[PDB]
Amino acid sequence: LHMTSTISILYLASTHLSLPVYTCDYIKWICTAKMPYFQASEILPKSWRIQ
DNA sequence: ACTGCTTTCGCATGAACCTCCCAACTACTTTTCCTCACACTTGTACTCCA
């Protein structure tokens, strides 16, 4: 598993739903730091992070 | 002989350190992750050369 994996299963849930959203509109949504792809560990877990 | 050098003494009672090991500040290894390029071999396409 890799942070690329949480994008891939998000893309399959959007193309089974048959949306006009793509990796053109995923790499623009993560490099602009909109959905928590970069530094997701630093902010989100807060208790599982230490272990 | 009287020499020297001892020595014992003192107003109540009240209060009146040295290595060594831990710290800061750096670097360099540690302890597991996911992500592909490379080297061949069978295969299908090529045009022969008599």
From Swiss-Prot:
It comes from the Eukaryota. Component of RNA polymerase I core factor complex (CF) that acts as a SUA7/TFIIB-like factor and plays a key role in multiple steps during transcription initiation such as pre-initiation complex (PIC) assembly and postpolymerase recruitment events in polymerase I (Pol I) transcription. Binds rDNA promoters and plays a role in Pol I recruitment. After binding of UAF (upstream activation factor) to an upstream element of the promoter, CF is recruited in a SPT15/TBP-dependent manner to form a pre-initiation complex. Belongs to the RRN7/TAF1B family. It is found in: Nucleus, Nucleolus. It comes from Saccharomyces cerevisiae (strain ATCC 204508 / S288c). Component of the core factor (CF) complex, which consists of RRN6, RRN7 and RRN11. The CF heterotrimer may further dimerize to form a hexamer. RRN7 interacts with RRN6, RRN11, SPT15 and RRN9. Although it shares weak sequence similarity with SUA7/TFIIB, displays a similar subdomain organization as SUA7/TFIIB, with a N-terminal zinc finger, a connecting region (composed of B-reader and B-linker regions), followed by 2 cyclin folds. This is RNA polymerase I-specific transcription initiation factor RRN7. Transmembrane segments: none annotated. Present with 398 molecules/cell in log phase SD medium. Disulfide bonds: none annotated.
